[PDB]
Structures are given as structure tokens and as C-alpha cells.
GROMACS .gro file of N, CA and C in nm:
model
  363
    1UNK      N    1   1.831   1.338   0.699
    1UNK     CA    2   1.936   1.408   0.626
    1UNK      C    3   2.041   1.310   0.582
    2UNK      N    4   2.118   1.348   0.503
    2UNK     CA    5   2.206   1.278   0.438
    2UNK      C    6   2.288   1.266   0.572
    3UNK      N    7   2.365   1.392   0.655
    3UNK     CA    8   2.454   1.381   0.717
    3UNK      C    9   2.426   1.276   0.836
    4UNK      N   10   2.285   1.265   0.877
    4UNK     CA   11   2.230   1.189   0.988
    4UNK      C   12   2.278   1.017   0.915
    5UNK      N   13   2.235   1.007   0.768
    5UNK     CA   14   2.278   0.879   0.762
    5UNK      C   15   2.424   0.834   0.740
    6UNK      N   16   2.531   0.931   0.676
    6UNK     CA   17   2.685   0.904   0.681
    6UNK      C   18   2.698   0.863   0.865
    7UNK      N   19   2.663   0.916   0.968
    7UNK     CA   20   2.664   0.913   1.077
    7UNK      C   21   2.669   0.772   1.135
    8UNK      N   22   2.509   0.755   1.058
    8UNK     CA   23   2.465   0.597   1.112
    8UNK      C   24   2.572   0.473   1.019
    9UNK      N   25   2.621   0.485   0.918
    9UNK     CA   26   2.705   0.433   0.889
    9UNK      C   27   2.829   0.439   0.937
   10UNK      N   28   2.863   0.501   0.973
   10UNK     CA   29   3.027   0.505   1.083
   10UNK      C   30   2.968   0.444   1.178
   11UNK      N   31   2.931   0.477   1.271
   11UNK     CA   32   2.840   0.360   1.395
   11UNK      C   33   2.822   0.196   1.356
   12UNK      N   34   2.756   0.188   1.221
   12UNK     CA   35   2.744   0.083   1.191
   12UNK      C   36   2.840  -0.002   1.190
   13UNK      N   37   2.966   0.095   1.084
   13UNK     CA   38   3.113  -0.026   1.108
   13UNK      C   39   3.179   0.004   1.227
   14UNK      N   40   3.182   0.093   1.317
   14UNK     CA   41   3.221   0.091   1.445
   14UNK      C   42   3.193  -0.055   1.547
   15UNK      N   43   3.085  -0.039   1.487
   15UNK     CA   44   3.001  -0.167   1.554
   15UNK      C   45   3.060  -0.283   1.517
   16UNK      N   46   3.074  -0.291   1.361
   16UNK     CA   47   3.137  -0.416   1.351
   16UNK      C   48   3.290  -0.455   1.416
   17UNK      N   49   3.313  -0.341   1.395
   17UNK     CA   50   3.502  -0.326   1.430
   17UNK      C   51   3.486  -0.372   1.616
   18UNK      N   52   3.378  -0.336   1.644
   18UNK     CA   53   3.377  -0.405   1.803
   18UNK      C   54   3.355  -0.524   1.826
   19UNK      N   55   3.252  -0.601   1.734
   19UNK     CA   56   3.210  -0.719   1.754
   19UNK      C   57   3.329  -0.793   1.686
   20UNK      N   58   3.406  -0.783   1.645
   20UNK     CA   59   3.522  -0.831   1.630
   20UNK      C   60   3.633  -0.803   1.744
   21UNK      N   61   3.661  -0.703   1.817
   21UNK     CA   62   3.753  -0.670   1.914
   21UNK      C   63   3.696  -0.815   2.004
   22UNK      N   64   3.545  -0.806   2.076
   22UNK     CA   65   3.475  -0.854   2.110
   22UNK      C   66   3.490  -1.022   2.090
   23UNK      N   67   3.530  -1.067   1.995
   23UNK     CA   68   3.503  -1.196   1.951
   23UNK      C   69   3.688  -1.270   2.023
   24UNK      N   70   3.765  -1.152   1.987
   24UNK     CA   71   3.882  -1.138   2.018
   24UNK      C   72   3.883  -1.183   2.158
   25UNK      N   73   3.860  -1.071   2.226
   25UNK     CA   74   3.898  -1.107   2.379
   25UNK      C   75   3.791  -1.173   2.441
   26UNK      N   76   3.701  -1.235   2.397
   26UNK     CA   77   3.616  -1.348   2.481
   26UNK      C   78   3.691  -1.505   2.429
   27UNK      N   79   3.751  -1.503   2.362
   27UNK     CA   80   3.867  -1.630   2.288
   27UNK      C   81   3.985  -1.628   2.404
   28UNK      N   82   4.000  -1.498   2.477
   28UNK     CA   83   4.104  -1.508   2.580
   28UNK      C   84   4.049  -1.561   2.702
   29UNK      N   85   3.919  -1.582   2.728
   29UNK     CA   86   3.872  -1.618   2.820
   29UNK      C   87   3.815  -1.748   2.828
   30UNK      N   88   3.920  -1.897   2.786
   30UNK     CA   89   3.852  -2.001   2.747
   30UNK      C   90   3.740  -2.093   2.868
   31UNK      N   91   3.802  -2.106   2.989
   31UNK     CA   92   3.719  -2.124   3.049
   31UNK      C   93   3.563  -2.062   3.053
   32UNK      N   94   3.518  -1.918   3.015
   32UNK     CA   95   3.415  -1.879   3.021
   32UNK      C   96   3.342  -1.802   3.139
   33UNK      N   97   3.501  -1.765   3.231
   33UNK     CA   98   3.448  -1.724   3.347
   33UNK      C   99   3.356  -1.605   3.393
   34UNK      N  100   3.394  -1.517   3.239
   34UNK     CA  101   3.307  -1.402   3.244
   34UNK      C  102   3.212  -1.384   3.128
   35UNK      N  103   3.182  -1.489   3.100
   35UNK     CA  104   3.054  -1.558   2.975
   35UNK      C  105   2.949  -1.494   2.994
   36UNK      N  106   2.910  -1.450   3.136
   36UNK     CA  107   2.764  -1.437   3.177
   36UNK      C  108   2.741  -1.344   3.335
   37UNK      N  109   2.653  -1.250   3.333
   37UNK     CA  110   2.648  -1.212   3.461
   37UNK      C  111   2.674  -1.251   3.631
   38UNK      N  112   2.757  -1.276   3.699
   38UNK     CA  113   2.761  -1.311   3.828
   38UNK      C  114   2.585  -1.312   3.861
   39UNK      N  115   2.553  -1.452   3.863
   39UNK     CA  116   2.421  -1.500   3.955
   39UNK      C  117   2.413  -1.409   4.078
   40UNK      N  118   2.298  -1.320   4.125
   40UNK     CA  119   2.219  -1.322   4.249
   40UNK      C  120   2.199  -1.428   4.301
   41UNK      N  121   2.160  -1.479   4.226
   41UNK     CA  122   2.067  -1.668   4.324
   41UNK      C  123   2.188  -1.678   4.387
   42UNK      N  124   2.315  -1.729   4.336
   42UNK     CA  125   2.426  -1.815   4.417
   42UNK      C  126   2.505  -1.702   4.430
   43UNK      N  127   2.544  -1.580   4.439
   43UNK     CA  128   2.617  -1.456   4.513
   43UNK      C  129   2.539  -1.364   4.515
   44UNK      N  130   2.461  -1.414   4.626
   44UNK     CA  131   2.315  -1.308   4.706
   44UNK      C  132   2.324  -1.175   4.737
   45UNK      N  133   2.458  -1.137   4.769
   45UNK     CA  134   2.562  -1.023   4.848
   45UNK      C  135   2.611  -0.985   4.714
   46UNK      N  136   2.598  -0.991   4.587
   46UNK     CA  137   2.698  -0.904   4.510
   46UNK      C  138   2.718  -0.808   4.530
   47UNK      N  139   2.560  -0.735   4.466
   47UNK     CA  140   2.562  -0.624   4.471
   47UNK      C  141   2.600  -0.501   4.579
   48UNK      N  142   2.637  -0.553   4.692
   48UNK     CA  143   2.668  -0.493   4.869
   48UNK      C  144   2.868  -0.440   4.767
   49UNK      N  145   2.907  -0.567   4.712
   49UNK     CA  146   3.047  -0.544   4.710
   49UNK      C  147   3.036  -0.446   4.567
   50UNK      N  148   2.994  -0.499   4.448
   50UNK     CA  149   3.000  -0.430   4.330
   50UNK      C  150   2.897  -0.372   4.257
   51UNK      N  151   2.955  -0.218   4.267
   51UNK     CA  152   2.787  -0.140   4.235
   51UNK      C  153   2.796  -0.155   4.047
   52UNK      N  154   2.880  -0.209   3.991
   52UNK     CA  155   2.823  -0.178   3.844
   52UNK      C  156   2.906  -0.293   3.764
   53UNK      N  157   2.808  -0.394   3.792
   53UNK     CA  158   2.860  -0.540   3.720
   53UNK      C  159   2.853  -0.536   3.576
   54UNK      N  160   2.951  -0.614   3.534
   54UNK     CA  161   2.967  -0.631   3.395
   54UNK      C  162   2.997  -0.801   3.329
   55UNK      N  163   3.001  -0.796   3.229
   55UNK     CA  164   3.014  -0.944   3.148
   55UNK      C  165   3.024  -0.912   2.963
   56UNK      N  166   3.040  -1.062   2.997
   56UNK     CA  167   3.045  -1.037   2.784
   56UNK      C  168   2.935  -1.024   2.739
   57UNK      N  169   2.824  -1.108   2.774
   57UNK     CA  170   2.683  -1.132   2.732
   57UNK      C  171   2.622  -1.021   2.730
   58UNK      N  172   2.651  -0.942   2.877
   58UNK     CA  173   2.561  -0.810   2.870
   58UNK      C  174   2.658  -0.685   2.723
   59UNK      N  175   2.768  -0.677   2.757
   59UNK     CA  176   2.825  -0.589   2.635
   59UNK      C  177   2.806  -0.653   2.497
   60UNK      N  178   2.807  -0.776   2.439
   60UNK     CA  179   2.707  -0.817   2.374
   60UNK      C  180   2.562  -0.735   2.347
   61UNK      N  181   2.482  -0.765   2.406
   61UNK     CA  182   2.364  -0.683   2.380
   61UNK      C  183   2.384  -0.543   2.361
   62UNK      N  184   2.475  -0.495   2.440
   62UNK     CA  185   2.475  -0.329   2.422
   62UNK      C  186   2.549  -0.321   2.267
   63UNK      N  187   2.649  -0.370   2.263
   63UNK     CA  188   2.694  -0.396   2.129
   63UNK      C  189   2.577  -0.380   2.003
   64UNK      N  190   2.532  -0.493   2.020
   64UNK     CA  191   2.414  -0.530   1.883
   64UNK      C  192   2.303  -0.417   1.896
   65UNK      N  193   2.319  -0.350   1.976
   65UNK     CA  194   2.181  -0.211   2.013
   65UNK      C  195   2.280  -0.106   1.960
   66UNK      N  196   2.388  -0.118   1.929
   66UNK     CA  197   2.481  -0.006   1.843
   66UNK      C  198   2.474   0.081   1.948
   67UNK      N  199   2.505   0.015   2.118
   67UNK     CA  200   2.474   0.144   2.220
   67UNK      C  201   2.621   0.148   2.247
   68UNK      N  202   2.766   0.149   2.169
   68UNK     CA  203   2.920   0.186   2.224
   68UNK      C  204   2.924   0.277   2.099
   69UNK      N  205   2.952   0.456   2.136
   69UNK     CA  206   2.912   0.538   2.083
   69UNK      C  207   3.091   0.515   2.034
   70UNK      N  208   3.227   0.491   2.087
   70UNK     CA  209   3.330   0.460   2.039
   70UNK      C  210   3.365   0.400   2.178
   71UNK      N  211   3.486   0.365   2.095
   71UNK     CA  212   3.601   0.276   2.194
   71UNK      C  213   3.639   0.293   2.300
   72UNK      N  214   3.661   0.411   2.368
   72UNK     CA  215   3.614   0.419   2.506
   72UNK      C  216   3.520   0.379   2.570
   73UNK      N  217   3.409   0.366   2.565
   73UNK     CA  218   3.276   0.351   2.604
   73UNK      C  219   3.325   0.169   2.611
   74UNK      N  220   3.337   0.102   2.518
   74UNK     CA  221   3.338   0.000   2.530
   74UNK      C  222   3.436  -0.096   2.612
   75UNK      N  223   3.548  -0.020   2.606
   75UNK     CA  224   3.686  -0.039   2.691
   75UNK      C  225   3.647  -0.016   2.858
   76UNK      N  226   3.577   0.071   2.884
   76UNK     CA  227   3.523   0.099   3.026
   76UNK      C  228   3.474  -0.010   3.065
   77UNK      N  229   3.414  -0.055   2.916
   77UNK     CA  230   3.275  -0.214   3.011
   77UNK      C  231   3.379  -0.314   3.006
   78UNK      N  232   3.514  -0.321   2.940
   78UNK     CA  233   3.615  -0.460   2.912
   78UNK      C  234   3.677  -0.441   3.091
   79UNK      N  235   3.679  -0.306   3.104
   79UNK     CA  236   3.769  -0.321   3.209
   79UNK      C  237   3.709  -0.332   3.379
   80UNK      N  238   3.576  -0.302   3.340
   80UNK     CA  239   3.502  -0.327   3.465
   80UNK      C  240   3.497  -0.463   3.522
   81UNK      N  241   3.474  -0.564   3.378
   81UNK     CA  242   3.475  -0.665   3.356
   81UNK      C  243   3.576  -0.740   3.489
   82UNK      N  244   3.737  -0.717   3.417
   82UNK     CA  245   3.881  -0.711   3.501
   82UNK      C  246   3.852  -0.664   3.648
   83UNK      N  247   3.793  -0.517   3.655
   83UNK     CA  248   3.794  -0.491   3.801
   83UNK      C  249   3.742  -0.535   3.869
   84UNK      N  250   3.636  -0.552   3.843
   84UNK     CA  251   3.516  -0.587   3.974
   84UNK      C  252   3.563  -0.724   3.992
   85UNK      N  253   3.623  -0.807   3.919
   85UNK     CA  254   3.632  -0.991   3.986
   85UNK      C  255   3.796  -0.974   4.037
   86UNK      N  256   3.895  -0.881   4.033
   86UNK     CA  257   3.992  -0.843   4.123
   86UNK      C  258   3.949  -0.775   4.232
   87UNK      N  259   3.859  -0.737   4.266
   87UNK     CA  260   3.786  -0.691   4.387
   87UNK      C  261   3.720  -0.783   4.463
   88UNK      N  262   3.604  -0.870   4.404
   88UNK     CA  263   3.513  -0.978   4.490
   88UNK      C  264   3.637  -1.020   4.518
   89UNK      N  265   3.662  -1.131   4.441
   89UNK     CA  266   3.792  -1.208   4.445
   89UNK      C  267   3.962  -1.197   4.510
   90UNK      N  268   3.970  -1.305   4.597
   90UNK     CA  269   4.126  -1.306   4.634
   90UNK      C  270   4.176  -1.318   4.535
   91UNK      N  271   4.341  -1.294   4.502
   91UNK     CA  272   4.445  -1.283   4.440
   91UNK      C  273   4.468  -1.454   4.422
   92UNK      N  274   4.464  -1.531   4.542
   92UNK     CA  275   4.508  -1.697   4.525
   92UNK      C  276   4.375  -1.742   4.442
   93UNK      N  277   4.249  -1.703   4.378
   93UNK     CA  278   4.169  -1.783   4.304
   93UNK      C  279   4.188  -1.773   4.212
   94UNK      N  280   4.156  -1.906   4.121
   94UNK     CA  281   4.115  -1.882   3.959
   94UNK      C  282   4.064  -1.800   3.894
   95UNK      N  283   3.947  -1.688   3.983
   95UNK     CA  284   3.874  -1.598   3.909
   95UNK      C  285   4.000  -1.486   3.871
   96UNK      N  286   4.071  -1.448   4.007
   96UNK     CA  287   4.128  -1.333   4.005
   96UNK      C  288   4.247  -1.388   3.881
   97UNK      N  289   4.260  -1.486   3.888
   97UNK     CA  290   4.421  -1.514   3.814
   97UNK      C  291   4.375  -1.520   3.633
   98UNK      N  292   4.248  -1.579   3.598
   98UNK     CA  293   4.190  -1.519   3.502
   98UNK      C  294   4.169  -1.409   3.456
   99UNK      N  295   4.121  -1.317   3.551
   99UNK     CA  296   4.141  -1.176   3.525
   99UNK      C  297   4.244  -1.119   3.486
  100UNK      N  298   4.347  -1.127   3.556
  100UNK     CA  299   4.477  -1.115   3.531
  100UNK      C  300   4.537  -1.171   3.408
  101UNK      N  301   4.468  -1.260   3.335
  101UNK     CA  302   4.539  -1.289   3.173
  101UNK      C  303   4.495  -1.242   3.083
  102UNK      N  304   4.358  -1.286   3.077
  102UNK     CA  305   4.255  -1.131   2.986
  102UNK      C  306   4.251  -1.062   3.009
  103UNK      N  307   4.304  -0.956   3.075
  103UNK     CA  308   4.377  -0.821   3.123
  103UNK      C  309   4.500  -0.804   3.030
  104UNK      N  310   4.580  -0.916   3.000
  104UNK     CA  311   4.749  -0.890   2.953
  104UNK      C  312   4.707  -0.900   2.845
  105UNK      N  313   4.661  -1.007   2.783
  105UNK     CA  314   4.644  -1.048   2.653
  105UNK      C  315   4.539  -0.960   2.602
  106UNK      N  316   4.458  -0.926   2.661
  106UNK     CA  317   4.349  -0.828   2.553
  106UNK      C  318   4.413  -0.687   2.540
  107UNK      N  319   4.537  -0.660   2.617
  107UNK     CA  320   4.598  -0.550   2.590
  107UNK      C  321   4.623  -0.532   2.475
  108UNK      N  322   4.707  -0.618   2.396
  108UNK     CA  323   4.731  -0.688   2.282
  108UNK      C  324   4.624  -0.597   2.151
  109UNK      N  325   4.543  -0.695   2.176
  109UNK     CA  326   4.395  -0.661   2.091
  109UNK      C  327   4.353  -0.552   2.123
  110UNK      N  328   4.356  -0.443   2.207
  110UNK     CA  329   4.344  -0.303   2.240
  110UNK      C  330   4.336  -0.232   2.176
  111UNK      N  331   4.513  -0.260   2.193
  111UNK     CA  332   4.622  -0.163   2.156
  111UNK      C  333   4.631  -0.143   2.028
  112UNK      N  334   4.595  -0.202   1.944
  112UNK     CA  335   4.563  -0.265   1.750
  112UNK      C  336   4.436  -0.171   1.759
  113UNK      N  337   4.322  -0.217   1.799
  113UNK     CA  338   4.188  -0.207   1.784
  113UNK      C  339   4.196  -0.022   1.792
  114UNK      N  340   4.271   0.069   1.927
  114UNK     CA  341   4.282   0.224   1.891
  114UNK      C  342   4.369   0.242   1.804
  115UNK      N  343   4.412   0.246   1.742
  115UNK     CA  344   4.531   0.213   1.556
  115UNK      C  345   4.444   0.231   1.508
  116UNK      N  346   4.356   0.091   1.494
  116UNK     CA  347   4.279   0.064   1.380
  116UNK      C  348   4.100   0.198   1.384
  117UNK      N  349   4.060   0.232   1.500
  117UNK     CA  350   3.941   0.355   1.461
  117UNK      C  351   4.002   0.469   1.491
  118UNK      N  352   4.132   0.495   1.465
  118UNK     CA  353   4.186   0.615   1.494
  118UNK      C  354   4.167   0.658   1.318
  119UNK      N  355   4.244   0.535   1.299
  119UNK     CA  356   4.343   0.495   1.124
  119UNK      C  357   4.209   0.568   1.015
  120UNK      N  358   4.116   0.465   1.010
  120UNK     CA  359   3.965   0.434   0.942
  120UNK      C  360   3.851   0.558   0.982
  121UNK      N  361   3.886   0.606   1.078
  121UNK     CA  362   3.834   0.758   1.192
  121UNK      C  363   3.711   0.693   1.221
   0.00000   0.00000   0.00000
């Protein structure tokens, strides 16, 4: 149907409008600390502490599978991101204190980003 494809086109630039949010707040994360899934091999015990790990790489893929139906959905995986390494993690490490800046600063880029698919619908 026609309406099925106007559909898939809102999704489509949704999508883009993420992979840009996306491009945004992984630039806040220069070190790269959350580049990539927390290893099993070298943190054997994750999963005991955190039942629903997250990263850029993996929201990446969900991204490009057009699987963030809107901005909530995707904000859940930014912030799991934040939670779960303020959880493993003490407050005195680099991980946690990283967290804590791409936390402030992607607020930033957020806060624009619901404006902007509110604005565009």
C-alpha cells in the first residue's frame, strides 16, 4: 500500500536522524570506552552483575536494521550504555568518570535531537 510505504519512509529518515545523533555522541566518547561490547573472555562474571549490556557497535547494528522504531527506543540503549558501567564500575575509575561526561554532554545532543523528530514528526 501506499500508506505502508509513506511509513517506511519516515523510518527511513528517522534512521538517518539517528545515525547522526549516533555519530554525535560516540565523538563524546574519545577514548572509545564504549566502542564495543564488554569482553566475556576478560570480564568472565559480567553477565552475574549486568543482565542487559549495551555499546555503540551493537546500537549500530540495530540502527542500520532500522530496528529504533523512535527516539525512545534508542535513548533506552544510550542510557543503558551510562548505567550499566556506573554500576560494574567504582565512582574513582576512568570507566565510571567517562560515563559521567557522555552522560552531560550527550544531554546536549538529546535535548536538540527530541526538538528536532518532534519538529519534522
Amino acid at each position: 500500500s501506499m500508506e505502508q510505504v509513506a511509513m517506511e519512509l519516515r523510518l527511513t529518515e528517522l534512521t538517518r536522524l539517528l545515525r547522526s545523533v549516533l555519530d554525535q555522541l560516540q565523538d563524546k566518547d574519545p577514548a572509545r570506552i564504549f566502542a564495543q561490547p564488554v569482553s566475556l573472555k576478560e570480564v568472565p562474571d559480567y553477565l552475574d552483575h549486568i543482565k542487559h549490556p549495551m555499546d555503540f557497535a551493537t546500537m549500530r547494528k540495530r540502527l542500520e536494521a532500522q530496528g529504533y522504531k523512535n527516539l525512545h527506543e534508542f535513548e533506552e540503549d544510550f542510557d543503558l550504555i551510562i548505567d550499566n558501567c556506573m554500576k560494574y564500575n567504582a565512582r574513582d575509575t576512568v570507566f565510571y568518570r567517562a560515563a559521567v561526561r557522555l552522560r552531560d554532554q550527550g544531554g546536549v545532543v538529546l535535548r536538540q535531537a527530541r526538538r528536532e523528530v518532534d519538529s519534522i514528526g
